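Escalation from tier 1.

The customer reports that the assembly of seven entities below gives different structure tokens on two consecutive runs. Tier 1 could not reproduce it. I'm attaching the input and our single run for tier 2 to review.
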Amino acid sequence: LDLKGSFLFDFEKGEFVKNADGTLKKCDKVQAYKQWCQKAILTPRYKKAAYTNIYGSEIKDLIASNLSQSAKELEITRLIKETILVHPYTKEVGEFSFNWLENSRLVEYEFDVLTIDDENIVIDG
Amino acid sequence: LDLKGSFLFDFEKGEFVKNADGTLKKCDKVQAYKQWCQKAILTPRYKKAAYTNIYGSEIKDLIASNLSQSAKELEITRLIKETILVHPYTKEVGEFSFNWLENSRLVEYEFDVLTIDDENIVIDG
Amino acid sequence: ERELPIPVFLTEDEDSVHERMLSNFQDVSTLEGDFIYDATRPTAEQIAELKQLGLQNNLKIAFPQTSYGTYLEWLGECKGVFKNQPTKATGVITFTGVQGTIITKGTIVTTIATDEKQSIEFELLETKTIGENETVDIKAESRIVGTIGNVSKGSISVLLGSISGVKSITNKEDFRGGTDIEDEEHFR
Amino acid sequence: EIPGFYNRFKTQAEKSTNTGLKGRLAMPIRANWGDVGKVVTIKNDLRQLKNLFGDDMNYSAFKLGKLALLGNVKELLLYRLVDGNQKKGTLTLKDTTENSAKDVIKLETKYPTARNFNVTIKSNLVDSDKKDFIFFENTKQLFSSSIKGTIDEIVLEINSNLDNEYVIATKVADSDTILANVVNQALEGGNDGCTSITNESYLKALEEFERYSFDSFVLDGVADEALQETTKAWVAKNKELGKDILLFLGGKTEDNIKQINDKSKSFNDENIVNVGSSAYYENIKYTPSEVAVYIAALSVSKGITGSICNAKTIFEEVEPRLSQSEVKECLKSGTLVLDFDDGDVIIVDDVNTFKKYVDDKNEAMGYISNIMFINTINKDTSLKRKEFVGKIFNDATGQTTVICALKKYFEELMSQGIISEFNVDIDTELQATAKADEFYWKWDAVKVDVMKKIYGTGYL
Amino acid sequence: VIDIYLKNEKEKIDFHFPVNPQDSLSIKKEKRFETVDIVNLGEFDIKKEGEKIREISFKTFLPNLYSELKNPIEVVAMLEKWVDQAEPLRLIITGFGYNGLVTISSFSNTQTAGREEDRDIEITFRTYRELKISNTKTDLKDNRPNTQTKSKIYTVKASDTLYKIAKNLLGKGSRWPEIYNIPENKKVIGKNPNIIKKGKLVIPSK
Amino acid sequence: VIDIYLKNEKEKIDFHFPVNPQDSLSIKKEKRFETVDIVNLGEFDIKKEGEKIREISFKTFLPNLYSELKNPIEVVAMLEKWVDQAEPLRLIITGFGYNGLVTISSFSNTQTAGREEDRDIEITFRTYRELKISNTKTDLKDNRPNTQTKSKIYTVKASDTLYKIAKNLLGKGSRWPEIYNIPENKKVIGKNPNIIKKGKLVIPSK
Amino acid sequence: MIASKKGKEMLLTLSPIYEQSIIMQSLYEAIGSEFDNLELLDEEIELQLFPQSATWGLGFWENRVGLITN
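Tier 1 run:
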């Protein structure tokens, strides 16, 4: 497998975190994977020409859709799930939740599961 | 495929449109196809000996038929659809509509779809 | 025209460029959407587009076997061969009207513009007066070079302005002075 | 026609697509062609607009009318604003045999204008006893016909043929011999009145529009402060008369973000909307005042159910591109701003000028869709009101009939899914002093809003 | 609340069923496995790694007058056309909580003795899947279905370049000579592929 | 309103069903596809390009007295004759909106205990198709069904010529020697094929 | 903000997170600068391909035809 680490990027500030040395703050494989996941969610699909069709999501386009609330919930689940699962490190994403806190303004949760989160059988002959 | 263009013919005037140069007004492949479609509809089938059995329609013969209104509507759809579809450029013809504006005097619509009207999938490995 | 052989380097695939660019990295991840991928992929893509379009087109215009347009003309000038130039349609237009009426040089008369066709503009080459006979003939020329023009006998019937006393403007015979730009392949 | 089979062909753009559209819009258009000083309704057809007002993009009629037409409005109420000095293209044609050249026929354009209509008459080559009358607009042929030499037929034949929607012939005098041959004689003396339109002249259109009814009103692509204030008062006046008109405006071309936001803050009526960005459409710029026409049309066309919170506009590029902070300021100021996103110009958040207060319940009043929803209900109730004011006996059964009518009307809105909950009941307080047309009632409803924002939290 | 949406893409139609699926929906799931016996031990279950295609079926009636609506005859013609569509359809069922690409296996309409305008429908779907036929290294999986469609004719925009059109509209982007080599594209486009104009109509292949 | 018309052509008969098709019509449609499994991936659906023959079936009774009518026995004899007809029949169903060439697969009549004059009918149709067994170039497709019939004996008209008769009545028109070489045609026609007279009876082949 | 025309386009081609990234903006400003120079250089090569617009390559043409390059 041998996934590799990457460099931090504070999405709050929209800038790379760099040490007092001036070098960019490296970080772990798992940290890099989390960095990648948020980026892929925020990247709309088919539009940013640097990436292929695999990368990116389509959540923004769903806003203009005329589908009902329940239909939009499933589409959110499909879109987020499809976008994340392309990464090798992903094991499973699910346990989605939704809260239409206002009449038409939504908050939703989902839980991601890594490959390392798997449970291993203990036996040998 | 390489369909080729043809020469305009104002069906309103029943004459070819010619430029001030005197040469007949050429026109596009798609314009030629539209010119062809109207001609084929107006050409009765099996009667004008220049053309084979493929060319032409039979709408005129349907006038003397004793079929009911609804039966005649389907026959109009079949006849127009069969006549047009022989052309390679046709993709589909349909969405037929009928309006018996008087007791026994009819107006009908239909929509033609070209080969170029098709929608193409965007993907490559 | 002849097909253009292209060097293998100028036809490199975009991914091949990007793959070579990422060859040196072995510590940091290079997955699609990763930061290293973000830094490198637009460069690789831009190289391929420039390499495949900009450079190959430059190679095409080099030789007369595949050059075109102004580029082919200059290669004609290398060996002193010039392509032919077009000419304006030339002819005569008959005018009828009041004898006192006067028609000046440079007056513009056109064909009948329509939805299907646009009017072809023609300019009079002479100044005349109708004083002797009601009919007069004036030499004219199409304002645009090329076989555009060369109209039929009775085509010219439109005056852009309105000259007092003129009863009818009609070309008498088809124009013949027009000729188009020489064909590129013929010139090649 | 003879019995038999006949057929024609038409471009798909010629389809009767007017079915299914919604909304009504008004415009005091400047036009080179068509009726002057009156309101005219168009059923969302480009050709109808073309025939009624020509196709000169230099004039605000076809230009803005096309944009509003692209906004999918069901009905567009156009008024040909004019400066005065109005005239119709006219010409007089004369007889040959009379050595005095007797004038026998006067031609005139159907409507006032200044476009170059021209006439060319030549001897009919087949027969000198007839002559070919060819009508021209500039160098373009517009209509041809041969005619008898008698004057009455000539005026009739010109007025007879189908293609003379532009010009109407008129007889000045009788004569025996055909008109004199002429080529491209312009119908001089006309005038479209587009020159030097006065600020005051807009007010004539306003009063004319008042007798009509429409969902919204938008200016003729003009950012003059006096007109905006005048229209502001005019719309406010019509509200007091019960006519709830929604106004769309756009700031001046040279106004920066500071000027635009201050303008929106200066008047924060929920019935007023400021466009804070120009836009592109096939290389033709549209000032914010001009763009407001398209914005007004889209808002009107969406009607009740739809909204333009993230609608993809027809435009191709917006000159002022704003950062999120700049967007936040403009949106906070009530400025309606179009944003460029991945080759798409998209309206953002459906706001109006009402943003200064947003006092709790009035937060919803800052959005165009909410106001459109409110105004339409008032109009529908006003329609049902006028059927019964002093025309049904003010008894409990009659009052119950009115409540049944209103309650069923709201129940239709439930069927559309517009509203989640509603109630309409007797206003017991104002019912204490009822009269013939002074029965009073109260209601409240819960409008369903369009989804606008999403928040996700990735647990990991 | 329950609704059914069929979002065809090769024909950009977003069909919404006017009527809910009658009595009851139901979807099965069956693990792909094989049974093997062993001498003096008996039967055993061996799981097979691959998944299994599963079906969704129901029945409805397309009413003549009811919330958006269309003629039942046209709707039947619409669906019967979609049956032969090689490309997949997206099926979403709100209350049942189903969402995934499917293709119509069988379709049938019926006119009862009364109610002649309506058409009783019985439809069956199949779960859809895709067949995705140097310097080995881990990379993103190709799990995303590529269900997206574009017009067969493209109008060039101002900022476009022929390479950019190829990537946006034909994938790899190096596919541009396929667009150029079409003689119609060669005619409208100048002899230089690198030069292009806003407007020119261009025909992507396939 | 619903009606059923069977327009036989090899026998120029336009049969109209006196009675509507009892309880309910129904037509299925099933995409022609095959299922294939792949190791470590599972099942997949492969569409097969060809279409599928589909059936229409119903049942009626041919009443003795009713609007045009005929004896049920003769009608059954008519249809049973048509069952063996190789040539196709045109079936039109107004209210159901069906129109296309079909051929009768199975047919059955029945006399109930009472109502001995009437004949309960149960009939089934199959969608019909045709098998159409230098200087390559695009041309019109051969989609038109060629269902048209003419008398086996032709009466020559005034303006006719032997080539014209061949094309109108035998297709290509160069087929005229087939007409001439028949000895009966040779006898009635003069020894010059180019000369012919109004009246002469001529026998097209087949 | 990026100054190079090519740099702005290339940055926009990536994910939209880099609005505030001075590092990424500065990076693609540098990348855009080189591609801008290459495009100008590429146009310059086109001029060398002909004797009429040879410019500094005119010595090559003089060298090609044997004229005394100077």
